[PDB]
Amino acid sequence: AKGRTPRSFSQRYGKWNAKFTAFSNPTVASTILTNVAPIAQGNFQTNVPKFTSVNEQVSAVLTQYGVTGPSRAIYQGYGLKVARALNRIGAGPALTNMVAGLKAYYVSAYGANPEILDAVTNIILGSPTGY
Amino acid sequence: AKGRTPRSFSQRYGKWNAKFTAFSNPTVASTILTNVAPIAQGNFQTNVPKFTSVNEQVSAVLTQYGVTGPSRAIYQGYGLKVARALNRIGAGPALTNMVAGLKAYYVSAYGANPEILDAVTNIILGSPTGY
Amino acid sequence: AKGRTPRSFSQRYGKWNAKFTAFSNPTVASTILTNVAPIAQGNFQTNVPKFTSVNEQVSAVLTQYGVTGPSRAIYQGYGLKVARALNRIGAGPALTNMVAGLKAYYVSAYGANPEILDAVTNIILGSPTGY
Amino acid sequence: AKGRTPRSFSQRYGKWNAKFTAFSNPTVASTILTNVAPIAQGNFQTNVPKFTSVNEQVSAVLTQYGVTGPSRAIYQGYGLKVARALNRIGAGPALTNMVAGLKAYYVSAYGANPEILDAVTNIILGSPTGY
Amino acid sequence: AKGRTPRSFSQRYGKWNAKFTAFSNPTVASTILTNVAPIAQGNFQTNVPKFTSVNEQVSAVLTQYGVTGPSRAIYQGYGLKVARALNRIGAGPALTNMVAGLKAYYVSAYGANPEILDAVTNIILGSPTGY
Amino acid sequence: AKGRTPRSFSQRYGKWNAKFTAFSNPTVASTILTNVAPIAQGNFQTNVPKFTSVNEQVSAVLTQYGVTGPSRAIYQGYGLKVARALNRIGAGPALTNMVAGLKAYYVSAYGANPEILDAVTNIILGSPTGY
Numbered sequence: 001a002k003g004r005t006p007r008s009f010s011q012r013y014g015k016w017n018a019k020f021t022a023f024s025n026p027t028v029a030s031t032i033l034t035n036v037a038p039i040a041q042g043n044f045q046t047n048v049p050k051f052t053s054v055n056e057q058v059s060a061v062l063t064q065y066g067v068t069g070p071s072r073a074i075y076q077g078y079g080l081k082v083a084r085a086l087n088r089i090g091a092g093p094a095l096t097n098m099v100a101g102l103k104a105y106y107v108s109a110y111g112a113n114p115e116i117l118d119a120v121t122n123i124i125l126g127s128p129t130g131y
Numbered sequence: 132a133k134g135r136t137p138r139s140f141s142q143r144y145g146k147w148n149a150k151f152t153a154f155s156n157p158t159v160a161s162t163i164l165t166n167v168a169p170i171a172q173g174n175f176q177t178n179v180p181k182f183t184s185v186n187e188q189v190s191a192v193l194t195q196y197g198v199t200g201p202s203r204a205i206y207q208g209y210g211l212k213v214a215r216a217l218n219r220i221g222a223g224p225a226l227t228n229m230v231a232g233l234k235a236y237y238v239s240a241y242g243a244n245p246e247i248l249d250a251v252t253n254i255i256l257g258s259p260t261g262y
Numbered sequence: 263a264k265g266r267t268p269r270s271f272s273q274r275y276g277k278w279n280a281k282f283t284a285f286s287n288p289t290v291a292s293t294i295l296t297n298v299a300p301i302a303q304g305n306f307q308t309n310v311p312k313f314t315s316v317n318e319q320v321s322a323v324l325t326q327y328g329v330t331g332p333s334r335a336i337y338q339g340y341g342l343k344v345a346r347a348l349n350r351i352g353a354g355p356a357l358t359n360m361v362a363g364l365k366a367y368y369v370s371a372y373g374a375n376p377e378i379l380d381a382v383t384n385i386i387l388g389s390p391t392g393y
Numbered sequence: 394a395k396g397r398t399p400r401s402f403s404q405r406y407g408k409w410n411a412k413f414t415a416f417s418n419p420t421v422a423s424t425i426l427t428n429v430a431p432i433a434q435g436n437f438q439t440n441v442p443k444f445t446s447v448n449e450q451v452s453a454v455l456t457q458y459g460v461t462g463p464s465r466a467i468y469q470g471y472g473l474k475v476a477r478a479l480n481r482i483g484a485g486p487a488l489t490n491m492v493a494g495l496k497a498y499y500v501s502a503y504g505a506n507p508e509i510l511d512a513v514t515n516i517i518l519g520s521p522t523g524y
Numbered sequence: 525a526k527g528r529t530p531r532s533f534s535q536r537y538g539k540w541n542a543k544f545t546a547f548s549n550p551t552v553a554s555t556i557l558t559n560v561a562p563i564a565q566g567n568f569q570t571n572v573p574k575f576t577s578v579n580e581q582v583s584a585v586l587t588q589y590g591v592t593g594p595s596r597a598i599y600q601g602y603g604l605k606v607a608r609a610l611n612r613i614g615a616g617p618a619l620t621n622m623v624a625g626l627k628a629y630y631v632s633a634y635g636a637n638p639e640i641l642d643a644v645t646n647i648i649l650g651s652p653t654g655y
Numbered sequence: 656a657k658g659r660t661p662r663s664f665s666q667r668y669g670k671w672n673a674k675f676t677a678f679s680n681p682t683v684a685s686t687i688l689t690n691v692a693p694i695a696q697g698n699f700q701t702n703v704p705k706f707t708s709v710n711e712q713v714s715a716v717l718t719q720y721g722v723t724g725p726s727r728a729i730y731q732g733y734g735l736k737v738a739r740a741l742n743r744i745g746a747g748p749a750l751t752n753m754v755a756g757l758k759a760y761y762v763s764a765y766g767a768n769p770e771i772l773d774a775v776t777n778i779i780l781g782s783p784t785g786y
C-alpha cells in the first residue's frame with residue numbers, strides 16, 4: 001500500500017516537503033540517526049570492502065593500459081557496476097546477461113574501449129565474458 | 132540507493148526495530164503526523180470516493196443475484212481490485228489484460244461465479260470484458 | 263458490531279479524520295506505540311524469517327534462469343504470495359487450489375513464464391503443483 | 394584537493410563514521426537542514442515537474458501496449474533515464490549517442506522490447522532515434 | 525619571514541597539528557568564521573559567475589561534438605583552467621603562452637582531442653589560439 | 656545523486672552560503688572538527704612524508720644546477736606534481752604518459768629548462784623518462 005495510487009507533482013512535493021520539514025527538527029533527526037547508527041555501521045562494514053578491493057584491482061589494471069585522468073573514471077565506474085551485479089544477484093546466467101548489457105551500455109553510450117572493458121571484467125569476475 | 136545490496140533477516144529486523152523505536156518517541160511521532168496531516172487528508176479525499184461508489188454499486192448488483200454473507204465479500208473484493216487497476220493504469224488494453232487475469236485469479240483460487248464476476252465488471256467498467 | 267450498517271464516504275472520512283487527529287497527539291501516539299512495541303517485535307520475529315528465506319531461495323532459482331531487473335520482482339512477488347498462503351491455511355487441497363489460482367493470476371495478468379513459476383513453486387513447496 | 398590520494402577501506406570507514414557521528418548531533422543536523430531547507434525546496438521545484446510529466450506520458454503510452462505489473466517499471470525506468478540525459482546535456486548529437494547507448498543497455502541486460510522503447514523515446518524526445 | 529628556514533616532516537606535522545587542534549575549539553572556529561563570512565561571500569559573488577558561465581558555454585559546445593560521460597569532464601576541466609588563466613594575468617602574450625602550454629598538457633597527458641580543445645578555447649577566448 | 660541536475664550560479668551560491676552559515680555555528684564546527692581530528696592526523700602522517708622527501712631531494716638537485724630564487728619553485732612544483740602522479744596511479748605506462756604530459760605543460764607554459772626537468776624526474780622516479 002505504497003505505490004497504489006498515482007501521485008502528481010503537487011502531492012509528491014507536498015508530502016516530500018512535509019517529511020523534510022519534520023526531519024529538520026532537532027529531536028526527530030537526532031533520535032532517528034542515533035537509533036540507526038549501529039545498523040548503518042554494520043551495513044557499511046559488510047558491503048564496502050567488496051568495492052574498495054575492486055577499486056584497487058581496476059586501478060592496477062588501468063595503469064598497465066595507460067589510462068590517465070577522467071578516462072579512468074569510465075572504467076572504474078564500469079567495474080563498480082559489475083561488482084554491484086555480483087553483490088545483488090550472484091554468479092550465473094543472469095550475471096552473464098548483465099555483463100553483456102553493461103558492456104553494450106558503456107561502449108555505445110560513453111565510447112569506452114572494448115579491450116579495457118574485457119580486462120576489467122577479467123580482473124573482477126575471472127573471465128572477459130564472466131562465465 | 133535503497134534496494135541495491137541484499138538484506139538478511141538480522142539486518143531487516145535491526146533496521147525495522149531501530150525505526151520503530153525511534154517513531155515511538157512522543158516528539159518524533161507527533162511532528163511527523165502533524166506535518167503530514169493535510170496531505171494525508173487530501174490523498175484520502177482524492178482517492179476514496181471512487182471506491183465507496185464501487186462498494187455501493189456492487190452491493191446493488193449483489194442483492195439482485197441473491198448473494199449473502201461472507202460470499203458477498205468475494206465479489207466486493209473483486210470489484211475493488213478491478214477499480215484499483217482502473218485507477219493505476221487507466222482504460223485500455225493493459226486494463227483488459229488485468230481484468231482477464233483477475234477473473235482467472237478469483238475463479239480458480241476462490242471459487243467465484245463467472246456470471247456474477249461478469250455482472251460486477253459490467254457495473255464497474257461498462258462491459259463484462261471491459262473494452 | 264463493526265460492519266453492520268452501511269457507511270458512506272462522509273462517515274468513513276469523518277471517522278478516519280477523527281482517529282487520525284487523535285493519534286497525532288504526542289501522548290496518545292507514544293502511549294499506544296510504547297505499549298504495543300514488544301508484541302510487534304514478537305510478531306516480526308515470528309513471521310519474517312519464513313519470507314527472508316523464500317527471498318533468498320527464489321533469488322538463487324532466478325539467477326539460474328537468467329532473469330534480471332524488474333522482471334525478477336514478478337517472480338519474487340509470486341513466491342511471497344505462495345509463502346503467504348502456506349503460512350495462513352497450511353498444506354493440503356486448499357493450498358493446491360490457491361497455487362493453481364495464483365499461477366493463473368500471474369500468467370494471465372502479468373505475462374509470467376509458466377516454467378519459471380513451476381521452478382519457484384518447486385523451490386518453495388517441494389513440487390511444481392504443490393501436492 | 395578531494396580525490397588526490399588513494400583512500401583504503403579503513404580511511405574511508407573512519408572518515409564516514411566520524412562524519413555520521415557528527416551529523417547525529419541534534420544541533421549539527423538541525424542547523425544544517427534548517428539552513429539548506431529553502432534551497433532544497435527550490436531545487437525540487439525546479440527539477441521534479443520534468444519527471445512527473447514523463448511518468449504520466451509514459452504511463453499513457455504503456456497502457457496502449459498492454460504492459461502491466463513490474464514489467465511497466467522497466468520502461469518507466471528507461472523513460473526517466475532518458476529524461477535525465479535531456480536535463481543534463483541538452484539536445485544534440487550527445488543526446489543521440491546516449492539514447493542509443495541506453496537502448497542497447499536495456500535491450501541487452503533487462504530483456505526490454507525495442508518497439509515499446511521506441512514508443513517511449515518518441516513520447517519523450519519526439520522521435521524514436523531522438524534527432 | 526614565512527618560508528625562510530627549511531622545515532622537515534616533524535616540524536610541518538607539529539605546526540599543522542597545533543593549528544588544527546587550535547581551530548577545533550568552538551570559540552576559535554566560530555569567531556574566525558563569523559568574522560570572515562562577509563568577505564568570503566563577496567569573493568564568491570565576485571569570482572564564481574565567470575566560471576559558471578564558462579561551464580554553461582562549454583557544455584553547449586560539447587553537446588555539439590557528441591561528448592558524453594566522464595570524457596566531458598576532461599574538456600570542462602581544460603576550459604576552467606583557461607578561464608582561470610584569463611582571470612589571473614589578463615589577455616595578452618602571456619595568456620597565449622599559457623593556452624599553448626595547457627593544450628600540450630591536456631593532449632599529451634589525458635589524450636584530449638585537439639579539435640574539441642580548439643572549440644572550447646574558441647568559445648571562451650574568441651579564437652582557437654587566443655590572440 | 657550529487658551532480659545529476661545542472662546548477663546555475665544562484666543555486667551554487669545559495670547552497671554554498673547555507674552550508675557556510677551552518678558551519679560557522681560553534682557546535683557544528685566544533686563537533687565536526689573534533690570528530691575528524693584523528694583521521695585527518697592519520698592521513699597527514701600517511702601522505703606528507705613522501706612529499707617532504709621529494710622537497711629535500713629536489714632542493715639538493717637544484718643547488719647543483721645553480722637555480723636560485725623564485726625560479727626554484729618551478730621545478731619544486733613540477734617535482735611535487737610528478738610525485739602526486741606516483742601516489743595516485745603508481746608506476747607503469749600511465750605514469751610515463753603523465754610524465755611526458757607534465758614536461759610538455761611546464762616547458763611550454765612556464766618556460767622551464769628540459770635538462771633540469773630531466774634531473775628532477777631522475778631523482779624522483781629513477782630515470783629521465785620514468786620507465
